[PDB]
């Protein structure tokens, strides 16, 4: 956010949701 | 000045240019047998000194003014 | 990335004073406005207060040094030679 | 009226210590004691000794400043000086 990745609050929220999904999938695949 | 005498219990005097408030209060007390509450002073543009002398409630400036003889 | 190709910190001087003079000013300016390490507490918290006076933000120590850099090479060599010859005085 | 100093009036001015009195009279201590006995000058005690002596608690002898001032006029003092010259 300091680096200007996110255009607004909705963009940050959706990116968080996607990143949590990616973390979940990565942990499940390493399981 | 006479409005002050009647309303505010204040006697207005022309005093000596060399006299300070202590001397004014003492002189008024000695000369007129009255108690003095406060003395305010100014120097008039004509070179003289004017004193507003406020007496205590025990004394009536109007009565003292009549006794002096100006009314 | 790089807002300026070559001019660097000397970009405040615009096109004035000449290329060579701007280049000469550049190195000393970079030294001067830099943040140096503290020899006393080991933190990069030392900045110049005035030419020759360098203060640490933490541990609040003021030291004497060079005009535009905390230490000069002459001072470093003088320090080392003092150490060496006082050691030989002891020995 | 500007601010007055804080050790000049009251007890500080009312009382004078023995050494200050002797110095002010410009006589010796023996002469001072003789004069005080001749004239009935006796030591006094301030109620506020710290205020009389600049906050000091040390035991001091105090006299009335007006009594010392009166003592300064005694002709017996002039007689003492005449005796010193004669000696």
């Amino acid at each position: 956010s300091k680096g200007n990745a996110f255009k607004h609050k909705r963009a940050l929220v959706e990116h968080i949701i996607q990143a949590k999904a990616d973390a979940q999938r990565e942990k499940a695949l390493n399981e | 000045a006479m409005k002050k005498v009647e309303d505010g219990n204040i006697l207005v005097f022309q005093v000596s240019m060399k006299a300070n408030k202590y001397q004014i209060k003492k002189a008024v007390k000695e000369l007129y047998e009255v108690d003095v509450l406060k003395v305010n002073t100014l120097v008039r543009p004509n070179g003289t000194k004017k004193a507003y002398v406020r007496l205590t409630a025990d004394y009536d400036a109007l009565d003292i003014a009549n006794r002096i003889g100006y009314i | 990335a790089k807002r300026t190709k070559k001019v660097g910190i000397t970009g405040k001087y615009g096109v004035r004073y000449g290329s060579s003079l701007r280049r000469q000013v550049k190195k000393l300016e970079i030294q001067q406005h830099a943040r140096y390490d503290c020899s006393f507490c080991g933190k990069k918290t030392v900045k110049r207060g005035a030419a020759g006076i360098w203060t640490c933000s933490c541990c609040k120590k003021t030291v004497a040094g060079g005009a535009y850099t905390v230490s000069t090479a002459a001072a470093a060599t003088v320090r080392s030679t003092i150490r060496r010859l006082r050691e030989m005085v002891e020995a | 009226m500007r601010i007055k100093k804080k050790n000049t009036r009251g007890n500080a001015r009312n009382f004078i210590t023995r050494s200050q009195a002797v110095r002010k009279l410009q006589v010796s201590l023996a002469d001072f004691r003789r004069l005080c006995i001749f004239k009935g000058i006796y030591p006094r005690e301030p109620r506020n000794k710290k205020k009389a002596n600049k906050g000091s608690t040390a035991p001091t002898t105090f006299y009335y400043a007006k009594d010392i001032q009166y003592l300064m006029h005694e002709p017996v003092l002039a007689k003492f000086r005449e005796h010193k010259t004669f000696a």
Partner: protein
């Protein structure tokens, strides 16, 4: 206040007196920074301040030793006879009792060449390059005056020259 060494006395002649650096401050019109050093007065129970010229490496809170038998460390002042061959000093006294005359500008120092048998004399190389012989009792601060490299930066501006030279006595701008 003028930048002078400590007044000579028995302590500095024989032993050492220890002072402490309180602040390193900027003097108007002088390139080198000044150091305020507080000593204990040997006779009277009171602290006395001194204004030395700061050498490179001197820092606040540092112990500065002054005397014949003080450690050969930067900041310490010593009689020139107490230092060995080849040392480097600053604020060198020309002769005993003048309180410092040589190598006072920033980045300048005086090297020791060698001593003398016949009396207490020492010879030194001055910043210009002259070779001079002074009394070996003359004192000096170990190290090099702080603030070196100052003349290497171009001023670039009449305004910077104006601000520099209004504090000095040099007439600026120059005429004739």
């Amino acid at each position: 206040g003028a930048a002078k060494l400590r007044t000579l006395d028995y302590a500095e002649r024989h032993g050492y007196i220890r002072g402490i650096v309180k602040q390193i401050v900027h003097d108007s019109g002088r390139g080198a920074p000044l150091a305020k050093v507080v000593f204990r007065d040997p006779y009277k129970y009171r602290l006395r301040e001194e204004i030395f010229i700061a050498n490179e490496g001197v820092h606040t809170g540092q112990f500065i030793y002054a005397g014949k038998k003080a450690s050969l460390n930067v900041g310490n002042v010593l009689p020139l006879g107490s230092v060995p061959e080849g040392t480097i000093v600053s604020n060198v006294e020309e002769k005993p009792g003048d309180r410092g005359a040589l190598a006072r500008a920033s980045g300048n120092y005086v090297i020791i060449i060698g001593h003398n048998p016949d009396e207490n004399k020492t010879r030194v190389r001055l910043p210009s390059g002259a070779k001079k012989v002074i009394s070996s009792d003359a004192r000096g601060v170990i190290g090099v005056i702080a603030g070196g490299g100052r003349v290497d930066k171009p001023l670039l501006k009449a305004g910077r020259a104006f601000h520099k030279y209004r504090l000095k006595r040099n007439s600026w701008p120059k005429t004739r």
